[PDB]
Paper text:
pmcp97, also known as CDC48 or valosin-containing protein (VCP), is a hexameric, ring-shaped AAA+ ATPase (ATPase associated with diverse cellular activities) that can extract ubiquitinated and nonubiquitinated substrate proteins from protein complexes and membranes. ASPL (alveolar soft-part sarcoma locus; also known as UBXD9, TUG, or ASPSCR1) is a unique p97 adaptor protein that regulates p97 activity by disassembling the p97 hexamer into smaller oligomers. One example is trimethylation of p97 at residue Lys315, a modification introduced by METTL21D (also known as VCP-KMT or NVM-1). Here, we report the crystal structures of a human p97:ASPL:METTL21D heterotrimeric complex and of the plant methyltransferase AtMETTL21D.
The trimeric complex of p97-ND1, ASPL-C∆, and METTL21D was crystallized in the presence of SAM, and X-ray diffraction data were acquired at a resolution of 3.0 Å. The crystal structure of the complex contains one molecule each of p97-ND1, ASPL-C∆, and METTL21D. In the active site of p97-ND1, a molecule of ATP is bound, whereas the active site of METTL21D contains a S-adenosyl-L-homocysteine (SAH) molecule. The crystal structure has thus captured the product of the methylation reaction after Lys315 trimethylation and conversion of SAM to SAH. METTL21D is bound to the p97-D1 domain, and the p97 loop, which contains the target Lys315, positions its side chain toward the active site of METTL21D. In the crystal structure, Lys315 is in a trimethylated state, which could be validated by test refinements of all possible methylation states. ASPL is bound on top of the p97-N domain, as described in previous work on the p97:ASPL-CΔ complex, with the lariat structure of the ASPL-eUBX domain wrapped around the p97-N domain. A striking result from the crystal structure is the presence of p97 in a monomeric state within the complex. In the crystal structure, METTL21D is bound to the p97-D1 domain, sharing a large interaction surface of ~1,100 Å2. The residues involved in the interaction belong to the highly conserved SRH motif of p97, including Arg359 that acts as the arginine finger crucial for nucleotide hydrolysis, and Arg362 that contributes to p97 hexamer stabilization.
Numbering used by the authors:
A (entry chain A): 319 to 333, 336 to 366, 372 to 496
B (entry chain C): 13 to 223
C (entry chain B): 23 to 428, 434 to 461
């Protein structure tokens, strides 16, 4: 199941981050120690298909669940839950399901910069659309309708959408 | 006409300000062998137990140049007599003046050309220090005859030098130890016994004794 | 309120910052979400966060553009947090820097701004310096006015305006064209060796002393001329904020005795006064060559002055001396003694992969045609060092500029419509003689 939800920033309910003291940015001896480990580990970086296959399989086992967000041009967000083995074509079908015009010529892309997802047969794991990705939506002939009016009535706040993904990834 | 000074820091914190001349003989600048030998006298192995080994003991530095080794020993309680050519006496007198406040023993600048007859040294000293003295004709025979006439059987000679691999330098080093073996018994001090920071794989400290 | 350590970016995009996957789960961030970065002195910037396997949990990767806006260097501590919420911009105002547009006139929007922001939804905050490549050059722009303020997203409905005269850059605003690690290729292993030695002792000598590692006083760089020894020293001096002082070997030795000694004293006086500092002795074999020592009155003992000045360098001086020579065996042994020139790094002739990195660096601003095969140029450039490959790219680009038209101010849309072809690189190779 996808568990579809729609959110918009003009629904956040309640309200400027606090300034940090200059002591927060003052490096400690352990901060300098951690920087030395980064420099030594970068120098350390100086493998066949079988190792990359295991590296990919072990990475797919870590995150068996995916949360995707389609950012419409009118600032609306269509949120759905997928699996890494599913393709970009399955994400297109999910978007078409909740479209006001289910025959609109649209395209999905990741920024910055504009990187269109042309390969519909490409899985979400290969397209780096995991575990949580924000994908933009474009249209050949832009119309204000976009999402179906029925879904916009049950639209939740963006903060509530963050609760839905954290709960889904925990269980 | 200008000059530059080398600051030789001791283990206790006090520093020896040594004046050097940019134009002139080889003795006008502080050599790396003098730095190795000066810092070797401060080692706890050399200092030993109780009062320092040099404290209240006579010591004669051959080929002092600036006088880095002789001045270091003078600050450790020793009774030093820094020697060199007649042209290096104004530099020896100047460096004694610049560091006489740190001297706990005594230090005098005398003239001593290697090979000549000894005039003002009737008693053999307890120590004979040498910093980078092996490099040419005078290091071969005249220097050895000075060592033989001056040193006694209980006189400890400490020869520190840098191994040079260009021109006449490697030949003179080989001939020095070939002739040194005829009257003296030399023994190389392991690099591990030298100062932890101011030591070198190509700078040797050797203990030479008479007979 | 999570502290992260600044490191070089893998993603070359200006608006992109990289973070480790477990840290993105810890911060509940989406891949492509907007983050708010802040550092010392109230400096702020909004970016797009992406996951990275190379990235460690406590580190963040940002490119020179973000680092110059945040006024941070590599190894600095920054604060990251999701910014709720950035609104799509109604209208923005952008103006280029005076030195960055010298010799270029015309529609800077069609050439630079239009493609840069085109459907990218880039988050820009007022007072931001950003870099746009094109027209055979890299142009820096500063967002003078934004609406809404201070943060806004450059959406497709945002009006981008570039009217006005180029602006003057402030002293605090350092150049993005300045030498950095992103400008060096072919010796990434040697750069990692050097960064481990000097980055921390220069920036934090008191905190590095507590670690226990003994900091280096001098570093020996050897290799043939034009291999990038000077380039590496300038880049490290800029990336750590160290004052750079260049000393030429035969240049100092050519000066009469007395003046050459006093010039060495002044070189070390400037470094000590402007701490931290990197003294670069190019062509060290001229100053300190190994020769036989004999009993003779020499007119100048320049090597003794060098060692006296190096030994007098304390931990409160924060000065690291890097020297360059083609023949390392002709260097006086006293230079590698008493921890003076302790480390040795070999910047040698680059191989096929290393040459491709240099070609990619020296063609990042120029527009290349489809037939251009940089991999082929790298394959057939044996014996070429970084200086030869940079001049090859300059002569190949100049060839394309000569074929069109027939220096003075050229149109922006004319230079952007120009593309260097493989026949220009083949002509440059036929004339290039290392
Ligand atoms: N590794 C490199 N990556 C990119 N450019 C390089 C590299 N090495 C050299 N260059 C280019 O070479 C030119 C300057 O060379 P550089 O001065 O650094 O070499 P060098 O080894 O110090 O020799 P020298 O100072 O005797 O000419 C610049 O155009 C620079 O971009
Ligand atoms: N025949 C000779 N008689 C006396 N001193 C001599 C000599 N030949 C050379 N010397 C001196 O021996 C020294 C060699 S250089 C050693 C300098 C000093 N020990 C230092 O290392 O700091 C010079 O001072 C030189 O003047
Ligand atoms: Mg050069």
């Amino acid at each position: 199941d996808r568990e579809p939800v729609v959110c918009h920033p003009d629904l956040e309910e309640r309200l400027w981050p606090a300034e940090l003291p200059d002591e927060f940015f003052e490096l400690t001896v352990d901060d300098v120690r951690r920087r030395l480990a980064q420099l030594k580990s970068e120098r350390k970086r100086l493998v066949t298909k079988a190792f990359r296959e295991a590296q990919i399989k072990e990475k797919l086992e870590r995150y068996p669940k995916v949360a995707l967000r389609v950012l419409f041009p009118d600032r609306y967000v269509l949120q759905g839950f997928f699996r890494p083995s599913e393709t970009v074509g399955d994400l297109r079908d999910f978007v078409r399901s909740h479209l006001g015009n289910p025959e609109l010529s649209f395209y999905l892309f990741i920024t910055p910069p504009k990187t269109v997802l042309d390969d519909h047969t490409q899985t979400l794991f290969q397209a780096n659309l995991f575990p949580a990705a924000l994908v933009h939506l474009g249209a050949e002939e832009p119309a204000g309708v976009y999402l179906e009016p029925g879904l916009l009535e049950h639209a939740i706040s963006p903060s509530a959408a963050d609760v839905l993904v954290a709960r889904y990834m925990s269980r | 006409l200008r000059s530059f000074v080398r600051v030789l820091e001791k283990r206790d914190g006090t520093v020896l300000r040594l004046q050097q001349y940019s134009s002139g003989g080889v003795g006008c600048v502080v050599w790396d062998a003098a730095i190795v030998l000066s810092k070797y006298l401060e080692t706890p192995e050399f200092s030993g137990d109780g009062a320092h080994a040099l404290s209240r003991r006579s010591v004669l530095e051959l080929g002092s140049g600036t006088g880095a080794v002789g001045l270091m020993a003078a600050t450790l309680g020793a009774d030093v007599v820094v020697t060199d050519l007649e042209e290096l006496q104004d530099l020896l007198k100047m460096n004694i003046n610049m560091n006489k406040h740190l001297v706990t023993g005594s230090v005098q600048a005398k003239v001593l050309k290697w090979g000549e007859e000894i005039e003002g040294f009737p008693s053999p000293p307890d120590f004979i220090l040498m910093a980078d003295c092996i490099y040419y004709e005078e290091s071969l025979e005249p220097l050895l005859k000075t060592l033989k006439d001056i040193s006694g059987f209980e006189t400890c000679i400490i020869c520190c030098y840098e191994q040079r691999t260009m021109g006449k330098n490697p030949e003179i080093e080989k001939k020095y130890f070939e002739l040194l073996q005829l009257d003296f018994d030399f023994e190389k001090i392991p690099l591990e016994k030298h100062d932890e920071e101011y030591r070198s794989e190509d700078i040797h400290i050797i203990y030479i004794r008479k007979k | 309120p999570n502290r992260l350590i600044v490191d070089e970016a893998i993603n070359e995009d200006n608006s992109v910052v990289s973070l480790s996957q477990p840290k993105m789960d810890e911060l509940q961030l989406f891949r492509g979400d907007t983050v708010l970065l802040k550092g010392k002195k109230r400096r702020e910037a909004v970016c797009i966060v992406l996951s990275d396997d190379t990235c460690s949990d406590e580190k963040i990767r940002m490119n020179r553009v973000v680092r110059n806006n945040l006024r941070v260097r590599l190894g600095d501590v920054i604060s990251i947090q999701p910014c709720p919420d950035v609104k799509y911009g109604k209208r923005i105002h952008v103006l280029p820097i005076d030195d960055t547009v010298e010799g270029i006139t015309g529609n800077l929007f069609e050439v630079y701004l239009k493609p840069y922001f085109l459907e990218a939804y880039r988050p820009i905050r007022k007072g931001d310096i950003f870099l746009v490549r094109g027209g055979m050059r890299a142009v820096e722009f500063k967002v003078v006015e934004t609406d809404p303020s201070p943060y806004c997203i450059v959406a497709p409905d945002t009006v981008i305006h570039c009217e006005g005269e180029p602006i003057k850059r402030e002293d605090e605003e350092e150049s993005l064209n300045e030498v950095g690690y992103d400008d060096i290729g072919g010796c990434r292993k040697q750069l990692a060796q050097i960064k481990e030695m000097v980055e921390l002792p220069l920036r934090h000598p008191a905190l590095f002393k507590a670690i226990g590692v003994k900091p280096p006083r001098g570093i020996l760089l050897y290799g043939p001329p034009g291999t990038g020894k000077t380039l590496i020293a300038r880049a490290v001096a800029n990336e750590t904020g160290a004052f750079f002082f260049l000393i030429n070997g035969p240049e100092i030795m050519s000066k009469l005795a007395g003046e050459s000694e006093s010039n060495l004293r002044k070189a070390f006086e400037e470094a000590e006064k402007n701490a931290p500092a990197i003294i670069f002795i190019d062509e060290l074999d001229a100053i300190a060559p190994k020769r036989e020592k004999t009993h003779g009155e020499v007119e100048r003992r320049i090597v003794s002055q060098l060692l006296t000045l190096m030994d007098g360098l304390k931990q409160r001086a924060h000065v690291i001396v890097m020297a360059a020579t083609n023949r390392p065996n002709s260097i006086d042994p006293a230079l590698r003694r008493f921890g003076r020139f302790d480390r040795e790094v070999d910047i040698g002739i680059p191989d096929a992969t290393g040459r491709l990195e240099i070609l990619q660096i020296h063609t990042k601003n120029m527009k290349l045609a489809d037939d251009v095969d940089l991999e082929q140029v790298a394959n057939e450039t044996h014996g070429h060092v970084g200086a030869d490959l940079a001049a090859l790219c300059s002569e190949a680009a100049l060839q394309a500029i000569r074929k069109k038209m027939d220096d003075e101010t050229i149109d922006a849309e004319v230079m952007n419509s120009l593309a260097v072809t493989m026949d220009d690189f083949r002509w440059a190779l036929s004339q290039s003689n290392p």
